[PDB]
Design a binder for this molecule. Structure first.
Ligand SMILES: [Cl-]
Lengths: 106, 109, 107
């Protein structure tokens, strides 16, 4: 049926703490608490102007950003090893970045 | 669309003084006089800063707060018993939480 | 964050403004502090008469706008009154309920 509830179960299969957000600040789904997201989003909007091209990730552990689509960003709080996180993102995209760009176009 | 209308009619079935607001303070629906409602906001602000969990309530009678989703707050003025109020909120959540969460997402503009 | 958007909204029409609390707390301001400190005792006394929430008070070039119980907008401007009242009505629609929650008068 509806994605987002599908994206979150995917992510939770390997990370407890995440958020699926849009570029303006809209949280579509999040297990990260509001206090952390409020201080986190201004940093993400900055990097979004030219440091995270669509399809790329950005690391500052425990925070990680993945621009799945042009408008949709995944935010992780994790200490997983790098290759696991990149692997999660690669799979998440190839199973979701089509449906997600279709449901949340810019 | 009609989600807030359905939320309102569900609450009005039991309490007459209520409001539904966003967690940034936007009033979506309120039968409480806007002046009286805005004076409960110091309490709400403290609840949100202490990150009261989704599904949890807070009682300062006659005022009652219920965090149905991350971004949607139910407010009551009521003298009804706590066990009835807590049942009302759990049924309210069951029927409307998922929809409210999609219709009213938290936003950090 | 919310105050940073308030500042940006105001800045689209006037450049000399301040957003303060009832007790005088500066939240954001492009007005020289020299001016604000000689301007606050006037605000305090207007607040006493309980200049109502939503109303403004003109003393050109100075304008006060009580957006919420606890938040005052101050402008130094030589714009016309209708333009100032229109900016205020717009400002209040976009920000008053948010501001009321972010900066509640306590007790
Ligand atoms: Cl929270």
């Amino acid at each position: 049926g509806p994605i987002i509830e599908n994206c979150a179960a995917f992510i939770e299969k390997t990370m407890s703490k995440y958020a699926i957000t849009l570029s303006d600040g809209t949280i579509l789904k999040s297990t990260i608490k509001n206090e952390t997201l409020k201080k986190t989003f201004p940093i993400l909007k900055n990097l979004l102007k030219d440091q995270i091209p669509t399809g790329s990730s950005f690391f500052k552990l425990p925070v990680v950003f993945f621009r799945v689509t042009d408008n949709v960003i995944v935010i992780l709080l994790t200490n997983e090893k790098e290759n696991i996180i990149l692997s999660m993102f690669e799979l998440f995209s190839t199973q979701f970045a089509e449906k997600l760009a279709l449901e949340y176009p810019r």
